[PDB]
Enzyme design. Sequence first.
Site, PDB file in Angstrom:
ATOM      1  N   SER A   1       0.784  -1.240   0.000  1.00 20.82           N
ATOM      2  CA  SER A   1       0.000   0.000   0.000  1.00 20.82           C
ATOM      3  C   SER A   1       0.818   1.293   0.000  1.00 20.82           C
ATOM      4  O   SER A   1       1.752   1.453   0.782  1.00 20.82           O
ATOM      5  CB  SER A   1      -0.950   0.028   1.202  1.00 20.82           C
ATOM      6  OG  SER A   1      -0.251   0.297   2.399  1.00 20.82           O
TER       7      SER A   1
ATOM      8  N   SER B   1      -1.137   4.101  -0.072  1.00 19.57           N
ATOM      9  CA  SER B   1      -2.130   5.001   0.532  1.00 19.57           C
ATOM     10  C   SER B   1      -1.621   5.766   1.766  1.00 19.57           C
ATOM     11  O   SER B   1      -1.881   6.979   1.909  1.00 19.57           O
ATOM     12  CB  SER B   1      -3.459   4.264   0.827  1.00 19.57           C
ATOM     13  OG  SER B   1      -4.134   4.054  -0.387  1.00 19.57           O
TER      14      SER B   1
ATOM     15  N   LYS C   1     -14.695  -4.761   0.358  1.00 21.47           N
ATOM     16  CA  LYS C   1     -15.547  -3.653  -0.054  1.00 21.47           C
ATOM     17  C   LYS C   1     -17.020  -3.980  -0.077  1.00 21.47           C
ATOM     18  O   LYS C   1     -17.846  -3.109   0.235  1.00 21.47           O
ATOM     19  CB  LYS C   1     -15.103  -3.075  -1.398  1.00 21.47           C
ATOM     20  CG  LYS C   1     -13.691  -2.516  -1.361  1.00 21.47           C
ATOM     21  CD  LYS C   1     -13.322  -1.783  -2.656  1.00 21.47           C
ATOM     22  CE  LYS C   1     -12.924  -2.691  -3.768  1.00 21.47           C
ATOM     23  NZ  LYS C   1     -12.308  -1.824  -4.816  1.00 21.47           N
TER      24      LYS C   1
ATOM     25  N   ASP D   1     -14.564   5.010  -5.795  1.00 19.41           N
ATOM     26  CA  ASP D   1     -13.984   4.321  -6.993  1.00 19.41           C
ATOM     27  C   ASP D   1     -14.439   4.966  -8.298  1.00 19.41           C
ATOM     28  O   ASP D   1     -13.617   5.249  -9.202  1.00 19.41           O
ATOM     29  CB  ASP D   1     -14.294   2.809  -7.046  1.00 19.41           C
ATOM     30  CG  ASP D   1     -13.318   1.972  -6.245  1.00 19.41           C
ATOM     31  OD1 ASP D   1     -12.568   2.545  -5.423  1.00 19.41           O
ATOM     32  OD2 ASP D   1     -13.312   0.723  -6.429  1.00 19.41           O
TER      33      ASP D   1
ATOM     34  N   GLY E   1     -12.533  -9.605 -13.884  1.00 22.44           N
ATOM     35  CA  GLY E   1     -12.910  -9.732 -12.463  1.00 22.44           C
ATOM     36  C   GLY E   1     -14.309  -9.265 -12.101  1.00 22.44           C
ATOM     37  O   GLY E   1     -14.902  -8.456 -12.819  1.00 22.44           O
TER      38      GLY E   1
ATOM     39  N   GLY F   1     -15.340  -8.092  -8.559  1.00 19.79           N
ATOM     40  CA  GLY F   1     -15.475  -7.420  -7.236  1.00 19.79           C
ATOM     41  C   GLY F   1     -16.109  -6.024  -7.260  1.00 19.79           C
ATOM     42  O   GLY F   1     -16.825  -5.660  -8.200  1.00 19.79           O
ATOM     43  N   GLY F   2     -15.861  -5.236  -6.206  1.00 21.33           N
ATOM     44  CA  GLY F   2     -16.390  -3.863  -6.127  1.00 21.33           C
ATOM     45  C   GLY F   2     -15.837  -2.918  -7.176  1.00 21.33           C
ATOM     46  O   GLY F   2     -16.560  -2.029  -7.676  1.00 21.33           O
ATOM     47  N   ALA F   3     -14.551  -3.075  -7.500  1.00 23.74           N
ATOM     48  CA  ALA F   3     -13.899  -2.247  -8.526  1.00 23.74           C
ATOM     49  C   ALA F   3     -14.495  -2.572  -9.883  1.00 23.74           C
ATOM     50  O   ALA F   3     -14.755  -1.678 -10.684  1.00 23.74           O
ATOM     51  CB  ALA F   3     -12.405  -2.482  -8.544  1.00 23.74           C
TER      52      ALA F   3
ATOM     53  N   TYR G   1      -1.679  -0.717  -8.451  1.00 20.15           N
ATOM     54  CA  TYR G   1      -0.521   0.132  -8.493  1.00 20.15           C
ATOM     55  C   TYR G   1       0.539  -0.323  -7.493  1.00 20.15           C
ATOM     56  O   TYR G   1       0.309  -0.359  -6.276  1.00 20.15           O
ATOM     57  CB  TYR G   1      -0.827   1.618  -8.296  1.00 20.15           C
ATOM     58  CG  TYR G   1       0.446   2.411  -8.442  1.00 20.15           C
ATOM     59  CD1 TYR G   1       0.957   2.700  -9.707  1.00 20.15           C
ATOM     60  CD2 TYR G   1       1.175   2.809  -7.329  1.00 20.15           C
ATOM     61  CE1 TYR G   1       2.141   3.399  -9.857  1.00 20.15           C
ATOM     62  CE2 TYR G   1       2.361   3.508  -7.466  1.00 20.15           C
ATOM     63  CZ  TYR G   1       2.839   3.800  -8.736  1.00 20.15           C
ATOM     64  OH  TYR G   1       4.017   4.500  -8.873  1.00 20.15           O
TER      65      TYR G   1
END
Lengths: 270, 263
Positions: free
Chosen positions: B14, B16, B65, B101, B125, B127-129, B204
């Site tokens: 991460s 972030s 998420k 997002d 995929g 998922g949430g993304a 990333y």
Amino acid sequence: MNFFGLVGEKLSHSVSPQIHKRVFEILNIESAYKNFEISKEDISKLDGAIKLLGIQGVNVTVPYKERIMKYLDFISPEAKRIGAVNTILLRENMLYGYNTDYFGLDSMFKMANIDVQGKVAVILGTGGASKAALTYFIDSGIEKLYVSTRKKDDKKLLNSKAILIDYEELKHIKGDIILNATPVGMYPNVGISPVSKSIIQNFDILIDLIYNPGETEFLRIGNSMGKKTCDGLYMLVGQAIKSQEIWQDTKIDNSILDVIYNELKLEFLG
Amino acid sequence: MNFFGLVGEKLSHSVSPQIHKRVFEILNIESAYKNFEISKEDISKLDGAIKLLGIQGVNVTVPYKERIMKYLDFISPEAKRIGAVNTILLRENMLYGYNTDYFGLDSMFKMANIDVQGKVAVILGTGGASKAALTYFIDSGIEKLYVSTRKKSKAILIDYEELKHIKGDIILNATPVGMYPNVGISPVSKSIIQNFDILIDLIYNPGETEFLRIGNSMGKKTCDGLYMLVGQAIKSQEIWQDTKIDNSILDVIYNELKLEFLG
């Protein structure tokens, strides 16, 4: 183009459409806001009409801030807490309820440099506005809080710390702040105050949530005694901006409130 | 002083925390942000801990998420639509769920001058993304949208076998394939990548992903997840600080990190 408005029973006086117009103009947004007067017998039809016509958002004022809640799909936690809604958002055919009353009060108090910490206050009236004011005062460390009503009957307050009184008992209460959350003092009879001069004399600061270009009798009586007074206009502008932030899901520059408030404060009168 | 952080199962990769630290520095805010690694068997305890300790806000990443939504007091309209939460706010002992997002994607596509109107896109995929990307593609006038999963609005669901025959403009990776666990692996083969003009990877890691490395080897247009990651961070801060943050901060931080991890 998106549509918005204000829902209430009688609105010929409201300055909200003008405030919202100014906010849309400053932000260069293609939207419009009007009054939606709706009778008590028709309020159950509002949610279907908002959804049908794609009205993106509405504000709610007296006497519907509590009664409208049952028609909403989701209620934001601050509105649940306070027990009233003044801002509704339509998204994906669902209605979300919010309450900007606590926020607007906080804003108004900071602007007026009024710290309620350890003070004694009286709220006049028991509507949704009163509930927000009660919530705000308690969170801010008010020492003693009274809420005055015409008839106690079986009325219950949100917090047991607040003391329910009637206007007779109010005659013997002395405190720092008296806040008017009643509909008294607006458009028709601007020469009538919810409380007598004798009661006003027992307080240092008067806060009136009502705004009228001609000045309320409540504040007019307060100013004659050199008391500190504050009208509702700043709060009205702040609440309009917060509503806009919710409706667009974006934050608005802090400087806009003062720009709009100062420009409007002249338009009604010098 | 206020505390914030990032909730996920594995967070060694991460960046972030660095982004948020830098936001606080620029804005002169007394706050701090760290990683909150939490196991799958413990995620039900998060809401209580946030409330108890007065943690003002957290981000949520994979694989939580969707799962976290069920523990919150209010789900915003966009989180409800997208169907995932990546930003939680604590206010008066209640938890509010938001999704940034969509905002980060929209921001990223505009910065990279990638217009999707009338195009063909594949999302890798579910998922949430994937949901945020799916929502964004649809709203932006995508012509044909496929979503690929190995185990199978107007999105066409396909498996990796069917994907072998699909030609399109954009392929977007919404899988966790490519980060820390196995950083030298791409979710799709070179044969599939050759069939698209633009690759978008939400992942990333300072070091380029294998997915984008393969795309670049073929002269394809590539876009990594950094801009979106910075944009989401600033949108999270606006929510947490309940204040507008100047958009110049996004370009400041992105360019510092891009220049840091490139040269």
